[PDB]
Amino acid sequence: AKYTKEDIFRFADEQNVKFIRLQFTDILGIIKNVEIPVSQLKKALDNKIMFDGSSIEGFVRIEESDMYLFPDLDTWVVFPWTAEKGKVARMICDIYNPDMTPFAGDPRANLKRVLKEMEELGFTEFNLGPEPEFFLFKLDENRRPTLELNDSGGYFDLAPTDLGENCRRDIVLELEEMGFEIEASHHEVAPGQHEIDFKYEDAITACDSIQTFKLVVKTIARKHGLHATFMPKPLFGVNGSGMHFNMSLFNEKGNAFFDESGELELSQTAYHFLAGMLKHARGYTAVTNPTINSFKRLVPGYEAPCYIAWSGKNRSPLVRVPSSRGLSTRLELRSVDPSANPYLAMAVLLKAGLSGIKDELTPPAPVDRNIYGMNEEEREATGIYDLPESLGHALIELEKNEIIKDGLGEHIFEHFIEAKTIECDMFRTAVHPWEREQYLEIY
Amino acid sequence: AKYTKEDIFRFADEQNVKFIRLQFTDILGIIKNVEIPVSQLKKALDNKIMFDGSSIEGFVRIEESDMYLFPDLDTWVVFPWTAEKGKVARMICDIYNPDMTPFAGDPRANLKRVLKEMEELGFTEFNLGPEPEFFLFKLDENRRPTLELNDSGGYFDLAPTDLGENCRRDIVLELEEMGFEIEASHHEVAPGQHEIDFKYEDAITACDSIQTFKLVVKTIARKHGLHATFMPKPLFGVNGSGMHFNMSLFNEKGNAFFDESGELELSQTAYHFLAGMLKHARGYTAVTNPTINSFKRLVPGYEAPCYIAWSGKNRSPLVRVPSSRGLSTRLELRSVDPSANPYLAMAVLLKAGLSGIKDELTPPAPVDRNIYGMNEEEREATGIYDLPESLGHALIELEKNEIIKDGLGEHIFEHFIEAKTIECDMFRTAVHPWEREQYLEIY
Ligand SMILES: [Mg+2]
Ligand SMILES: [Mg+2]
Ligand SMILES: [Mg+2]
Ligand SMILES: [Mg+2]
């Protein structure tokens, strides 16, 4: 109980907020909210706010249903970019049915249910540290994004320098002032691409931090006359954007992935988690990469994980184990992209990993032979397998796998497949300028 | 023997040709030629012309190999649009290895081999009548195609009218003057789309007529300041272009598909051919639709065949049997598009149909229930199956089927597979403006 009702009332009185955003996330990952005056703060705290519940279902909404908007007190945050005409505050809200039951279609409720399963299994918390990457594009005269980048930087380069602008520095400063924990920020290898690293907190707080980070980055980029994009592959021939998850499992004693007497300073729980992640990776590749553009990033190379393997020496595997040990022991999954929904992503990941522990699966031997060059026979000889190359194959894998369905729940599962198949069918029937430019003259 | 060497020499002397195009077709269907003066007509007739044989292999050429260019006398044609500075003539040429053997990679030689198999099986000829459809686009200031059509016509509409222009009428008149047999021409349902129907001749002559028709249509359009396109789906939301094949099998007695005492006035040979076509349709869908844009035309509707069924009453099936009987009895395949290679198309079709006759397969019962609306269970209850929805699945079906491989030969099979896989990989890794407009601002 970080905050209480009286604390929220006192904060609203003493920083004098007049606008409150009760925000939530739908299946597609779009940040949605209802906006109320500060005079209705009491009604929000009393959990009596109605809203059109079909909104969270996305564009496939059919039947309107009124449902509650139970908020969370620990997520009270006041934005500074509010001028003098009243402050603005946001609160992450749970979705509840009118019968005082959490909605099955709410990703946050699904993540809470999966975390409850973890806790009743024997663990305490599921820490996550994400490393999102975003692109910045110069706006046009009509406040429209262009295809030109703000600077021609490089990997870890000091590209934006100083003396005003430097949107990454301003974003980091605003996030720090607002009350977020930032480890480090740098320039990614692609021009105009930046990465900001976060500390390690709980899974739900990790989702809240990710969503708030997306909102803040978009707002600050817009205010500086730029456009912030989290699409994985904005341009061809340019490196994509990733959101690598550094995740660790904790118990009553402490870190469950650390053991000084084990191989690689890893506990058997860590190996079971690795086996669970590797076995079902093809299953949840769709959840971790929900957009068509996402699979354009997953191409064979030296930085895009398109194989199913784990390593700790050669790096660039599907799952990488950082050299740090002790309380910082963790397993990194590099196939996640910023367009993914964090709630569903760690829901399916936790389920897969925990199933690997329940089944006590033995992970395959790590590969440190730089798996990009070996022949197809060599890859087939080892347990190396490729991730799905398109959204449709990933959707088929989802429809085949059953554990990921349980981790996602029912309602979320059917809604996700429905919306994704519509997006896939829309992409399939479209005619692109590539086909015209390479067949109009030839044929 | 329609023509002899002396006849060719006399023609060259009396219409005074000075430019000769020894033209041939590669695997991809692109019309290629070598151009020689009339003084070298003797060397061409002596079958002593060398050329870089790796050209017919396409862009996947690796090793240069010199090989002969044995021409065909029956295809001597003189173009009229040659002004006064000498006429131009073309001759379809077979590809021969330096050891006096036909090249395995020549589509025409493969078709000749398949026809030899047919003849030794007991049949005489394989008549074909194609119905190609093409689009006309207005050129820009820099002689570049635009996205605007020449007229907003309709199905069978009298759109181009008269008083000059009317590129379809001029094309038909030039083709008739040149010595081709034209049944009828009309305006297709899409704006700016025209269809010209041909008579029924032998398969090799059908290929020659199709290639000459493509060349003539392109040339006349260019002269009239327009661009002729055979790409199946130039625009989204606009009907595609088809090249329906009306094919019949002949024997010593006459038409092998006609029998007054049989059901539907059809012989058992016709039913065996139908069964062979239906069984392997998924196999040769790739050959009949060799481009990525081709499968954008094969979408569920009322005019695009995306199902595997035959009918003669409801129309719009995969294979339609026209009501005409007697010597005009024929089976129409509607899945072919103008971008396909006619040689490979009828090679695989003849093989499939003849295999159905050899195996005496019984075709499934025809469906006249307008197969667009019945539920998926209803379609599954009947032997209705869908054609491959993408080029990759069609390539997989080709790699699985063995009869189509025999019909294509070895060299053609591997070269086609390599080229199509390269093209599919290029399409897969590209980033299209659709993705940007759908995820850039959203994510
Ligand atoms: Mg990075
Ligand atoms: Mg990382
Ligand atoms: Mg037609
Ligand atoms: Mg037709």
Author numbering:
A (entry chain E), B (entry chain B): 2 to 444
Original authors' sentences:
In Gram-positive bacteria, nitrogen homeostasis is controlled by an operon encoding glutamine synthetase (GS), a dodecameric machine that assimilates ammonium into glutamine, and the GlnR repressor. GlnR detects nitrogen excess indirectly by binding glutamine-feedback-inhibited-GS (FBI-GS), which activates its transcription-repression function. GS generates glutamine from glutamate, ATP, and ammonium by a mechanism that involves the initial phosphorylation of the γ-carboxyl group of glutamate by ATP and the subsequent incorporation of ammonium. The structures show FBI-GS binds the GlnR C-terminal domain within its active-site cavity, juxtaposing two GlnR monomers to form a DNA-binding-competent GlnR dimer.
Thus, we next obtained cryo-EM structures of apo Pp, Lm, and Sa GS to resolutions of 3.16, 2.85, and 2.13 Å, respectively. These structures revealed that, like the Bs apo GS, the Lm, Sa, and most of the Pp apo GS states are dodecamers. Interestingly, overlays of the individual GS subunits show that the apo GS subunits are similar to those in the FBI-GS-GlnR complexes (rmsds of 0.5–0.8 Å for overlay of 400 corresponding Cα atoms between GS proteins). In this conformation, key active site residues are not properly positioned for catalysis. In particular, the Arg62 side chain is rotated into the active site preventing the proper positioning of the catalytic Asp50´ side chain and Arg316, which assists in catalysis, is moved out of the active site. In fact, the electron density for the active site regions of the apo GS structures are poorly defined indicating flexibility in these regions. This suggests that they could undergo conformational changes during catalysis. The structural comparisons show that GlnR binding favors an inhibited conformation, which is also adopted by the apo state. As noted, although the apo GS structures are not optimally configured for catalysis, their active site regions are not confined and appear flexible. Hence, these regions could readily transit to the active conformation during substrate binding and catalysis.
